[PDB]
Amino acid sequence: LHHAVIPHGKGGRSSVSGIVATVFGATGFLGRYVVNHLGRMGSQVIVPHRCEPYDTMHLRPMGDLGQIIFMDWNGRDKDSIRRAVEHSSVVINLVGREWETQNFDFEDVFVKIPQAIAQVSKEAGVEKFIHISHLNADIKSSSKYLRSKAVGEKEVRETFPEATIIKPAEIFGREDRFLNYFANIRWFGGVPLISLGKKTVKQPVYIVDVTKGIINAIKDPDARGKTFAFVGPSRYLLFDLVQYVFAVAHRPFLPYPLPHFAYRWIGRLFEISPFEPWTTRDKVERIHTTDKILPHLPGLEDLGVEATPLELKAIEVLRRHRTYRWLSSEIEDVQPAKTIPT
Amino acid sequence: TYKYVNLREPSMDMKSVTDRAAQTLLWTELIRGLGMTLSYLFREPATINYPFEKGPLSPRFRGEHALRRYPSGEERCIACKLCEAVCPAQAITIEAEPRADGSRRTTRYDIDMTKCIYCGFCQEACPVDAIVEGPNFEFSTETHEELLYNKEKLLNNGDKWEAEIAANIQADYLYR
Amino acid sequence: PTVKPPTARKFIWTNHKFNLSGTPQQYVPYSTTRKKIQEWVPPSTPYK
Amino acid sequence: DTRPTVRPRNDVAHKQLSAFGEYVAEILPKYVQQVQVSCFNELEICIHPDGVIPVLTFLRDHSNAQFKSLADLTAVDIPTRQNRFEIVYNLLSLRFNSRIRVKTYTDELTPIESSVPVYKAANWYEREIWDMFGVFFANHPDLRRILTDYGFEGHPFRKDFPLSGYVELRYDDEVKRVVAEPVELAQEFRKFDLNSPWEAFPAYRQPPE
Amino acid sequence: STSVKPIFSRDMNEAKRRVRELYRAWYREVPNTVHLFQLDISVKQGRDKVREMFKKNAHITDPRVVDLLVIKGKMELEETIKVWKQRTHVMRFFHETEAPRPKDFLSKFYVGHDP
Amino acid sequence: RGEYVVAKLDDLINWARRSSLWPMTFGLACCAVEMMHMAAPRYDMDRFGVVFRASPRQSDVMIVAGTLTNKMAPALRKVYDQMPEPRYVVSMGSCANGGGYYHYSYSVVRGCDRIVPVDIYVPGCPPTAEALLYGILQLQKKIKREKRLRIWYRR
Amino acid sequence: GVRTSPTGEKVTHTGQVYDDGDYRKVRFVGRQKEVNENFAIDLIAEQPVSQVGSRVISCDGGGGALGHPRVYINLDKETKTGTCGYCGLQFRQQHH
Amino acid sequence: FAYDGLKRQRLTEPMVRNEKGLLTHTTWEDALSRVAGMLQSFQGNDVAAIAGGLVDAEALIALKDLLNRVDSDTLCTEEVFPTAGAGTDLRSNYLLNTTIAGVEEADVVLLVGTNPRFEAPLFNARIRKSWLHNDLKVALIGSPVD
Ligand SMILES: COC1=C(OC)C(=O)C(C/C=C(\C)CC/C=C(/C)CC/C=C(/C)CC/C=C(/C)CC/C=C(/C)CC/C=C(/C)CC/C=C(/C)CC/C=C(/C)CC/C=C(\C)CCC=C(C)C)=C(C)C1=O
Ligand SMILES: CCCCCCCCCCCCCCCCCC(=O)OC[C@H](COP(=O)([O-])OCC[N+](C)(C)C)OC(=O)CCCCCCCCCCCCCCCCC
Ligand SMILES: CCCCCCCCCCCCCCCCCC(=O)OC[C@H](COP(=O)(O)OCCN)OC(=O)CCCCCCCCCCCCCCCCC
Ligand SMILES: NC(=O)C1=CN([C@@H]2O[C@H](COP(=O)(O)OP(=O)(O)OC[C@H]3O[C@@H](n4cnc5c(N)ncnc54)[C@H](OP(=O)(O)O)[C@@H]3O)[C@@H](O)[C@H]2O)C=CC1
Ligand SMILES: CCCCCCCCCCCC(=O)OC[C@H](COP(=O)(O)OCC[N+](C)(C)C)OC(=O)CCCCCCCCCCC
Ligand code: SF4
Ligand code: SF4
Ligand code: SF4
Ligand SMILES: [Zn+2]
């Protein structure tokens, strides 16, 4: 639009930021933070949801009256996609699953749905499109999750050439399935790590940093057509990271090696769950996939975000995993884990 | 004039001491408390069968707001803004301009039903009986935004409840 | 009402509607005033 | 006093209060600055701030005063005065079925002696005055906010404090707690200029400037 | 004229003693505050915040104003030691949810009309 | 068929939750007096299965009956957080809806919906005991139309 | 009368409607726009003009104390009809 | 009654010429960058400014300082005033030195080439008040206007 919405106010709850945003997948881990930041500054947010309306309740307090609008949509219904994007200026795709259901598989979730959203968004006149890929998305990956990420990333780059693609590392936060996942292995006694976790390197990134990069990409005109890699400030071996998680949670760490083939047999066992699986074959592959180093892509520092170290925020995530004896332990009680030099 | 509530001296004759001894040992004044609640068990309860029965109200009841019309269909409100000036909560926002026919009418008549204290001062101050509080009180909503009434919502309320609203004003306007 | 019916008016709803909150017929607030400041529209022909 | 709509005067009480006002000013000339009686028979004693403990002690203990009850204690903020605050003591005498009002003054920085020694009732009234006006009471057994929120900055009942304040609270899901942010109002409070440009009461006309 | 009733301190030299006494109480309290309230900040961040609050009023030369600041500071300390404050009240000194507002003229120019 | 079964199971749990609503014993201001009259014999909320319980850990519904001030707001969020799910909030009265008579006060939260999610807004100042009971029966109909299991069945 | 804008949205009696590009139309998706179908400007125009024999006529809106403050309308002009400033009813003097 | 003109034909966004040669909306950053690029590439007499009739003193001095940073002095106005002699060097040369309230003390007023009824309606009202109350003698050289 030649004369778009003009911002007003001082960036508060009752202000107008001029951002009309449709956020697909707003009811997940990354969605609640994005919707919070958009609504925190007075933005019209359309939140299409597939879940029960009860599951969207925590989003209602995130915006002033009339700023958060909820709609029904179906990933395989283009008409419902067009209803929820035909008035927006930016569209943010945060749709993803870490496991395959009987009705949706990684191909359907990470290739078909993103393409349909981008295709309809282009026809509707949307100008800004933000798509969340994965850092380790490559076509030659043992993880079917990471193969579909690569295919979907290029489909979006073709359907919406001016799209902004963001490739985060393993994000960690209060509701994450990364640090909570490791601290929840205490239920099984010891932590099985392929190659004892000394052949894998991780570069986790804080949730708020990823959120502030997404918000800064909406406001920055230089992010059109770019592909960003959001990574943390430090790289860790899988062993030192998991050892740190158990140190902050104050729980006994009893790691042992486990062959790759056996670990995939465990993943197959836990896939039979008709609910959110505790683990899967794909989750084992991603956990043990070394984080890529992509110096040719812009990162958080370009969008204007200082990456938060994992050592300043692990306790915010891992404190609830402690027993009463250790709840009150302060942040300056576990020495930082060994970092692989830059 | 005053009276004492707990200034009494108990009798000390042997028959009065024994009476109090029997009360202490046989729980007579506690058995008497049981007899009072037993009586209620055999009375008809005071419960009404809502929503099939409704608690009694009166023509003065102050419920949901409504904008009324004259019998010809013309709006009674002429944008005087007396309701806006007297509203204790500042729940009323009004804008007005000459209508296409030159009539003094409103272009905005909003009542924030979450600021309003349902006091009726607006209908007292209206010189044309335009804004009234109707008899409706069952208008709960599932979202906050639905309680920010605009002019269209208030005219719809008036057209919906006019039959009842007119009869209540007919029953109470001589007291006003 | 069967012994003393209400006065008839041609604007009174003939069909009564119950509480519509939570349905597609619910009420959505909006501003009923027109735009106040009119923006300048540049000419569509180049000056050159 | 036969007029139905007009409030009748009680000139017996007016004389009695005027007589007793002189009586107090004669006994405490060191502190009494001005005495007056209103047209509805309320006696006011205006004192120097140093006389808070002597004046109230006399009015509570003297056999001809016996004001054993502190009805209320409050402050009024008048910015145009050099001493913007006006501490008001409303006392009740059960023995003589009478009431008296004692008034003094102070500013943002000058303390006023605490009257808890004279009236145990003043403990919370002085906390409220401090909390809502920022007037410090010396030697108070424990002075701190009573009505405002913890960490609240400023004194709401000052005339220069805005009606809606400076901060407001919401819940933020990122930090999982209630936060405080600068106030933004969806609808600004609408200031009404109600004063009529015509004088209402000639009896109170102030001399021209 | 210029002769005023004091509060606690008769001169700045006496007043500064109360400032130092208050600073030592806050300094010793931060480790307990970061522990009881289970704050996700460090003892260094808390003590830096205390220093930031004190230097904010380093330009005062009126002893009475200094006396009130110490009085207000001791009320804050009492509220924190006794846990009358909640985690929300102790974190309001850090403004974690306030987006950084612009400071330079150009940034203020682009976003609005305020000076 | 699997869709038929999950539909009937959904009707069962939805029925159980709306027939056994346990409000937390939580009232703030004048609006709590009108909430007492809904428990009084004339309306007898207990006959609908609605029973007050003081512990937030045994409550299914929070009725924010009265004014919410900035001082009390952290307490409200805490007790709301300590409610096991599923949990519904009913906002009663102008103060709890949008600030009401005290919208423009330095010390009042302009609506409880800034602190917690709200399922039903009951208007009035105060709503009559019969108007709060309408909101409770409107909440029960809202629970009756939940599709938790059906939505799970086709994920 | 109630008329629809080209995009389909109804126009209110105040002449309010959202433009085709206004993002605020999103609030009506899955819901409806509340509009009162009884435009008061049309209904008053349907009332007949009342003929009277006097130069000055009074209107209280009908219903006595249930109407509006009694006002007196001058009917000397022949070109136009005197109109009640409160309720819009028109009066005309018989044969000037 | 001319205030209602403040609600129409208002400029509300920066604009620039696109490839087609039409004005199109743009951001403040983009608009001030183009104007800054050209101002850097020119100096001296190549930069000039004209001030309209509704311009304020604060804007006038800021623009004069800006053009003086490129050694330009072509700060013009749409309203002509002779520069011959003292020009604008002396304020008395281009002022109403008797003051509006001084018309009430004058006894002869000579109007030269001006229709004060429409050029300064309140100044003309002041003359009529002196005409009515002080028996002022008014003479005019120009078109016989009412
Ligand atoms: C005026 O000033 C003010 C106050 O001052 C008074 C205030 O206070 C407040 C603050 C206000 C509030 C906090 C709210 C006030 C509201 C009220 C309604 C209080 C008024 C008074 C009352 C008497 C209300 C209700 C209290 C009582 C005591 C009534 C007694 C009746 C009851 C039904 C209560 C419970 C009784 C019984 C017998 C048990 C029922 C309980 C259950 C949990 C149900 C059964 C339990 C089960 C576990 C299920 C059974 C089956 C199982 C377990 C399975 C078995 C079968 C298998 C197959 C396994 C304010 C603002 C105020 O301004
Ligand atoms: C002639 C030969 C000489 C010997 C003859 C002796 C014959 C008489 C024998 C003595 C009779 C003693 C009766 C029992 C007394 C025990 C109670 C007592 O101690 O009283 C004092 C006590 C306390 O009385 P008190 O509070 O006033 O204090 C007494 C002592 N002073 C005054 C000094 C402090 O009373 C109670 O026990 C209160 C009861 C608690 C409330 C319970 C609810 C009431 C329930 C009522 C229904 C009961 C149904 C029971 C039947 C169930 C059937 C299965
Ligand atoms: C008549 C009823 C027979 C059936 C009752 C069976 C139940 C027995 C248990 C209850 C006790 C009653 C029996 C005690 C004697 C009562 C009759 C009596 O005392 O004579 C009446 C006479 C009149 O009393 P009066 O003169 O007005 O004032 C008392 C001044 N001494 O009073 C007197 O002046 C005489 C002297 C009074 C003082 C005597 C000591 C009495 C208290 C001792 C404890 C009695 C209870 C012991 C048993 C406990 C187990 C129940
Ligand atoms: N560790 C991490 O968080 C990583 C995140 N990413 C990517 O970010 C994106 C956001 O995921 P995240 O927030 O982290 O975790 P979540 O799984 O919690 O977010 C998933 C969101 O997408 C929705 N969703 C999933 N499948 C469907 C479907 N068939 N149809 C409609 N909606 C669906 C979900 O809705 P509903 O709940 O109603 O089913 C939910 O709102 C994902 O694409 C992920 O691949 C990339 C790097 C690391
Ligand atoms: C002690 C050991 C416990 C074992 C685990 C028990 C709980 C889980 C069982 C689920 C099995 C399953 O598979 O049911 C699910 C199947 C259909 O499967 P689907 O759609 O392919 O699911 C794939 C995953 N989705 C759904 C997310 C896409 O639905 C049915 O036909 C029935 C489902 C309801 C349960 C019926 C039982 C009724 C009991 C009534 C009691 C009063
Ligand atoms: S009832 Fe009272 S508070 Fe409500 S709109 Fe009317 S005057 Fe205002
Ligand atoms: S509703 Fe009545 S009081 Fe309010 S503006 Fe209209 S005519 Fe005036
Ligand atoms: S809404 Fe009305 S009755 Fe309820 S607390 Fe507020 S003022 Fe009191
Ligand atoms: Zn009329």
mmCIF file of N, CA and C in Angstrom, chain A residues 9-11 40 174 312 315-316 319 327-332, chain E residues 31 34-35 38-44 96-97 101 111 114:
data_model
loop_
_atom_site.group_PDB
_atom_site.id
_atom_site.type_symbol
_atom_site.label_atom_id
_atom_site.label_comp_id
_atom_site.label_asym_id
_atom_site.label_seq_id
_atom_site.Cartn_x
_atom_site.Cartn_y
_atom_site.Cartn_z
ATOM 1 N N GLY A 9 1.885 6.880 18.881
ATOM 2 C CA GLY A 9 2.150 6.571 20.269
ATOM 3 C C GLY A 9 3.623 6.411 20.571
ATOM 4 N N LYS A 10 3.884 5.880 21.765
ATOM 5 C CA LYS A 10 5.236 5.696 22.271
ATOM 6 C C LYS A 10 5.620 4.222 22.359
ATOM 7 N N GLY A 11 5.102 3.399 21.452
ATOM 8 C CA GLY A 11 5.483 2.001 21.414
ATOM 9 C C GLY A 11 4.921 1.151 22.527
ATOM 10 N N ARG A 40 2.890 -6.384 22.185
ATOM 11 C CA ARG A 40 3.456 -5.524 23.215
ATOM 12 C C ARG A 40 3.647 -4.096 22.730
ATOM 13 N N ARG A 174 11.944 -21.351 28.243
ATOM 14 C CA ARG A 174 11.154 -21.986 29.293
ATOM 15 C C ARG A 174 10.350 -23.163 28.754
ATOM 16 N N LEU A 312 23.599 -17.224 31.019
ATOM 17 C CA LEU A 312 22.799 -16.219 31.701
ATOM 18 C C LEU A 312 21.328 -16.593 31.808
ATOM 19 N N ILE A 315 19.391 -21.106 34.043
ATOM 20 C CA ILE A 315 18.713 -21.254 35.327
ATOM 21 C C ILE A 315 17.253 -20.841 35.216
ATOM 22 N N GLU A 316 16.950 -19.838 34.391
ATOM 23 C CA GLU A 316 15.555 -19.482 34.153
ATOM 24 C C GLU A 316 14.769 -20.662 33.601
ATOM 25 N N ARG A 319 15.541 -24.229 36.549
ATOM 26 C CA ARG A 319 15.308 -24.182 37.988
ATOM 27 C C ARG A 319 14.166 -25.104 38.393
ATOM 28 N N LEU A 327 16.494 -25.731 44.971
ATOM 29 C CA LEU A 327 15.744 -24.692 44.272
ATOM 30 C C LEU A 327 16.418 -23.332 44.399
ATOM 31 N N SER A 328 16.938 -23.014 45.580
ATOM 32 C CA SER A 328 17.433 -21.672 45.859
ATOM 33 C C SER A 328 18.869 -21.445 45.404
ATOM 34 N N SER A 329 19.536 -22.449 44.838
ATOM 35 C CA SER A 329 20.909 -22.264 44.386
ATOM 36 C C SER A 329 20.986 -21.124 43.379
ATOM 37 N N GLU A 330 21.973 -20.251 43.557
ATOM 38 C CA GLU A 330 22.078 -19.050 42.745
ATOM 39 C C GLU A 330 22.765 -19.350 41.416
ATOM 40 N N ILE A 331 22.734 -18.355 40.527
ATOM 41 C CA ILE A 331 23.275 -18.536 39.185
ATOM 42 C C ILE A 331 24.789 -18.709 39.232
ATOM 43 N N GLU A 332 25.462 -18.001 40.134
ATOM 44 C CA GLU A 332 26.919 -18.091 40.255
ATOM 45 C C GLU A 332 27.333 -19.264 41.137
ATOM 46 N N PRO E 31 22.874 -10.021 48.167
ATOM 47 C CA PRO E 31 22.993 -11.488 48.139
ATOM 48 C C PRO E 31 21.790 -12.198 48.730
ATOM 49 N N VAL E 34 18.772 -11.696 46.140
ATOM 50 C CA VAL E 34 18.890 -12.554 44.969
ATOM 51 C C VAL E 34 18.672 -14.017 45.329
ATOM 52 N N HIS E 35 18.726 -14.356 46.614
ATOM 53 C CA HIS E 35 18.537 -15.729 47.060
ATOM 54 C C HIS E 35 17.084 -16.015 47.426
ATOM 55 N N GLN E 38 14.747 -15.656 44.504
ATOM 56 C CA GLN E 38 15.115 -16.545 43.405
ATOM 57 C C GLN E 38 15.209 -15.782 42.088
ATOM 58 N N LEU E 39 15.807 -14.597 42.142
ATOM 59 C CA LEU E 39 16.022 -13.802 40.945
ATOM 60 C C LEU E 39 17.055 -14.465 40.044
ATOM 61 N N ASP E 40 16.850 -14.329 38.736
ATOM 62 C CA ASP E 40 17.776 -14.856 37.747
ATOM 63 C C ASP E 40 18.885 -13.870 37.407
ATOM 64 N N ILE E 41 19.155 -12.913 38.285
ATOM 65 C CA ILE E 41 20.253 -11.989 38.111
ATOM 66 C C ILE E 41 21.390 -12.399 39.039
ATOM 67 N N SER E 42 22.555 -11.799 38.837
ATOM 68 C CA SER E 42 23.714 -12.066 39.671
ATOM 69 C C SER E 42 23.820 -11.029 40.783
ATOM 70 N N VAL E 43 24.607 -11.364 41.805
ATOM 71 C CA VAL E 43 24.857 -10.412 42.882
ATOM 72 C C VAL E 43 25.540 -9.167 42.338
ATOM 73 N N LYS E 44 26.289 -9.304 41.243
ATOM 74 C CA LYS E 44 26.936 -8.146 40.637
ATOM 75 C C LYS E 44 25.918 -7.218 39.985
ATOM 76 N N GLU E 96 12.782 -4.804 32.282
ATOM 77 C CA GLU E 96 13.147 -5.843 31.327
ATOM 78 C C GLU E 96 12.234 -5.878 30.108
ATOM 79 N N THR E 97 10.994 -5.408 30.223
ATOM 80 C CA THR E 97 10.043 -5.456 29.121
ATOM 81 C C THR E 97 9.912 -4.135 28.377
ATOM 82 N N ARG E 101 14.195 3.030 24.273
ATOM 83 C CA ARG E 101 13.736 4.190 23.532
ATOM 84 C C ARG E 101 14.926 4.936 22.932
ATOM 85 N N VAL E 111 10.459 8.502 14.877
ATOM 86 C CA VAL E 111 9.378 7.740 15.496
ATOM 87 C C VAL E 111 8.208 8.613 15.944
ATOM 88 N N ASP E 114 7.817 13.772 20.124
ATOM 89 C CA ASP E 114 8.288 14.145 21.445
ATOM 90 C C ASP E 114 9.714 14.689 21.372
#
